[PDB]
Design a protein around this ligand. Structure first.
Ligand code: COA
Ligand code: COA
Ligand code: COA
Ligand code: COA
Lengths: 263, 262, 262, 261
């Protein structure tokens, strides 16, 4: 009896198959990278606007400079003379709850609040009372004084193409409240993509409510940022190889050593 | 004090994000796509549209090749071990670079070295057979002339229809005519096609000098293409094992030979 | 500009290296060993000799458990793909977690909470079984009451002979009597044994307050013991695959059920 | 035919075995961590002085502060709220030719020079003429004026306990020359451990010259630093969490953005 099960790709036959679509049909149907992601991650032929939204998400998350945790770590590996994969992975491993990997939790938290019937102000006050950070809100450098154009682009697309945007609308109401409290509490790219994907999955017509919930629960949304930002991290690796930057060592003047005494 | 880091690809400090000198709104207004964003971030060039589309086609054809290959299998094992997406993806990516996923790069370098040495295809084939070296990017387990690899056919047709010049692909196709005459399954395979066509894009699209094209190949651009493309399939395998509720795996002892010292 | 980083464990700025307030020469003069260095670097404490020796025993008993387990299997595949030592080690380490090798933190937390709350062993088990929650540190795929784990025996024997008190181990063993009477594979596994024995060590060695001991459990120190110990074996498997001249692995299709959508 | 082959550990029986030794015998013989490493990596019961040297190497490489590439990367992951393994791995992935991973190359380069009969001065000149860095030489902060006590501790042990140290003696002659040229060109911890392991493996009696050279070739020596430094990287992970350190973002003033116009 077979010990493994697989559903997404069959490479055994005359032609490669992605989720029951032979590769020739993938190209004949002009499915693009977004359509291939729809097949491999969601086992569906998603609508064109959904495929294009996926591609837009990969484009807008591609890079955000060398200062962020993962790009900084990739740059260090590259400067340590490591190979592409080691350097990329060293940076990818920083993606999580604080940096880049709040899409899953933003989708879950905003969907829960919305579906439960609580209004935006009740959601904000409940999270504050419980000491819970709102996932998908907040940014170290972008703010109401320095808005995030990636969020604007995504919003504009969703409004032009999506048949329904109730969760995005709810999250934008939350953002009006949080930014009035502190200017950095914007709806960040993780929050935008997360809530937009809930609206997309629930209303595109390719999924049942249970199927959409399963995709959010198993972590598909965070994958969008991982795949998108991998392009920028590889770009930083290549750039540092071209720049011929030597081994980095962090300066002692930026480190406070406070070791135990009387040992 | 002087800056310790240098960067050339992206500037997020302003009001509007910039990728290699193009503000993010312009990237979208010019319909650059994923391939154009790659050209900006990896090469700091605005590539022609046909080159951007070829890059996307490469990412589509390399997206996945089933669960049995080294990296997909390692990602599946992590997923079955209850790990998170990034850990599982990275466990599989870490298998890439030599015997798995390294042939795009190896084929681009080998064919480029032969072409740049000024030797003709027959001299190249004979030099490799004398040196007991396999030609990288040549050979398939079952495909042959008149039974093509469809991934090769699709990409090759696009490249020949859109690229102004394809001298390295032309050379590789001349090598294929010779190797297939020796053994019919010695076709130009998908690694060979992508490798040589990617070199032809860098050398002939007009955005690079030869020094820049050769440098991007040397520092690993084709390793990047395989990694970025295949990451999509590996994430897919992670999600699939969770969808299929697959539990912890432990390899059976009946498929392991234990030969410890006496 | 104020310092952006804070650190407490090692100072390499002076002529002589310092580990947690001790110059490296003093570490060797005091014969601290690997276990004593771990006490300094992970806990910033001087530990009794039996605690240091227990730590070393844990690292020795977790060093390896064959090539079939998730992480060793992944390391081997990665070595067979021609990759380097660190990539291959890390591909295997990334499988460590809730199902394989990384149940020490959760076992320590769940047994400590039950023990501290005064719940008797049967009430803890029945609760967990009624709730469908797995008891972390219980269960094994191949070891059982019919095939006992000698690593557990060795650890138990040491802890009972050398520790001043073993209340959490004693509680966990009462739980194991109950779970193994239900199903023979529901043994106290190495993750459970080390997890509870470390709680007993931290709480009763005299180097920690209860609050300090609870914090190190909370932040995840205990899983580190298995990661550090098993890294020796995974490096061993990497070297073994090179010494055995093992080639590229591909999982056999006969062991995979392809159920794609129609 | 079996799809996997293995020779280091057999867990199929009632009692676990490491390279032919049942786990109870490992403890009965007081083999320690160093002895277990001898079994799992070298398939040998090594002499006690070799086992103790292995343990000393793991102790001296355990940590070297938070500024080095790998510790820094681990710290960044920890500050990004990641788990232990992800954070450790992010730092281990920096180990290589420049940082922590020059033991294999130092052993190879020094062994091939020594065996070739070339004297230390002519080896230094030959590498300089060929534009090749001497692996195992050099350090960013340790120098003639800021010596490395780890190297001193290791040297003292090797001189007191090893039966023969010809490669270490040769490397120390190379160091005298390179440090006269530039103060940073010390024999670093990678070079010391690499060359000492060649002396250990060739002269402990457990290996033939062929077996000893194969170990250098497959890359066992780099594993000593990886295994040792993993303790320090885990220590940094724990430390950042205990210190409740938040998400890090590098300051823009320390980055020169030079994009195309
Ligand atoms: C991204 C992030 C680390 C940036 O935080 P920051 O700008 O450095 O802000 P600080 O951590 O200094 O916190 C400042 C204050 O804002 C509050 N705050 C920050 N982010 C918050 C959020 N998401 N929800 C609620 N309150 C938040 C803090 O609790 C703190 O309040 P206090 O003054 O009452 O203590 C943080 O907003 C966050 O963790 N967000 C959630 C994860 C996420 O969405 N990440 C993706 C963006 S990188
Ligand atoms: C796919 C592949 C296994 C098919 O080969 P095969 O039909 O099994 O060939 P065999 O191994 O049975 O060898 C049969 C003959 O074909 C030759 N041959 C096979 N592949 C060849 C290649 N790529 N270039 C030149 N000659 C080749 C062999 O040298 C042998 O010649 P001989 O009979 O004169 O000794 C093989 O072509 C291959 O591995 N190609 C990929 C090369 C590559 O890109 N490798 C990347 C990792 S280095
Ligand atoms: C290690 C582990 C995967 C082995 O599981 P296994 O032997 O393959 O058993 P299965 O997953 O097939 O489960 C079989 C039955 O035993 C039960 N079971 C297995 N582990 C259990 C646990 N830790 N607590 C309670 N019940 C358990 C299952 O609930 C199931 O019960 P059912 O017959 O009523 O449905 C599992 O015991 C586990 O996850 N343990 C907790 C994690 C841990 O401590 N890991 C370290 C050891 S590798
Ligand atoms: C560790 C290392 C990166 C530190 O370098 P550093 O002190 O920052 O020195 P720089 O890179 O600024 O180079 C300064 C000069 O010393 C020379 N140099 C540095 N390391 C050298 C070596 N290992 N062999 C010969 N010359 C060396 C450089 O060539 C340069 O010479 P130049 O001024 O004539 O161009 C470097 O010594 C090295 O790569 N060593 C080999 C790898 C190794 O053993 N690493 C383990 C220690 S972290």
């Amino acid at each position: 009896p077979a010990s493994f099960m697989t559903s997404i790709c069959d490479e055994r036959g005359q032609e490669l198959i992605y989720a029951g679509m032979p590769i020739t049909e993938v190209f004949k149907e002009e499915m693009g990278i977004g359509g291939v992601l729809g097949l491999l991650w969601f086992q569906k032929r998603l609508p064109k606007y959904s495929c294009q939204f996926i591609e837009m998400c990969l484009m807008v998350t591609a890079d955000h400079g060398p200062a962020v945790s993962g790009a900084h770590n990739t740059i260090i590996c590259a400067r340590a003379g490591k190979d592409l994969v080691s350097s990329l992975t060293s940076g990818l491993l920083t993606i999580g709850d604080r940096f880049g990997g709040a899409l899953d939790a933003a989708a879950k938290m905003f969907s829960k609040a919305f579906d439960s019937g609580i209004i935006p102000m009740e959601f904000v006050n409940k999270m504050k009372k419980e000491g819970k950070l709102i996932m998908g809100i907040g940014h170290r450098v972008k703010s109401i004084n320095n808005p995030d154009m990636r969020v604007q682009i995504l919003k504009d697309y969703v409004r032009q193409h999506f048949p329904a945007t109730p969760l995005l609308d709810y999250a934008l109401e939350v953002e009006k409240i949080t930014t009035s409290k502190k200017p950095n509490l914007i709806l960040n790219v993780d929050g935008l993509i997360g809530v937009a994907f809930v609206d997309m999955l629930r209303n595109c017509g390719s999924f049942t409510r249970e199927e959409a919930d399963e995709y959010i629960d198993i972590g598909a949304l965070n994958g969008i940022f991982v795949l998108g930002r991998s392009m920028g991290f590889i770009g930083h690796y290549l750039d540092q190889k071209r720049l011929k930057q030597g081994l980095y060592r962090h300066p002692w003047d930026d480190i406070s050593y406070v070791l135990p005494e009387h040992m």
